[PDB]
Structure 1
């Protein structure tokens, strides 16, 4: 008879999270890799010097 505004809007936020799930999940991974890269670098110094010397 009535109450569908609460039911649909709770189910659009539910599906909104499912659509926002893979975006945050590669943005996220892509973020965790960007650090492996920062940890890898800054060690270029040692390696560069060792090689040139």
Structure 2
């Protein structure tokens, strides 16, 4: 007879999270890799010097 505004809007936020799930999940991974890269670098110094010397 009535109450569908609460039911649909709770189910659009539910599906909104499902659509926002893979975006945050590669943005996220892509973020965790960007650090492996920062940890890898800064060690270029040692390696560069060792090679040139």
Q: TM-score range by the shorter chain?
A: over 0.9
Q: TM-score, normalised by structure 2?
A: 1.00
Instruction: Give the total of aligned pairs.
Output: 53
Where in structure 1 are there 5+ consecutive unaligned residues?
A: none
Q: TM-score, normalised by structure 1?
A: 1.00
CA RMSD of aligned residues (A): 0.0
Where in structure 2 are there 5+ consecutive unaligned residues?
A: none
Moved beyond 2 Å, runs of 4+: none
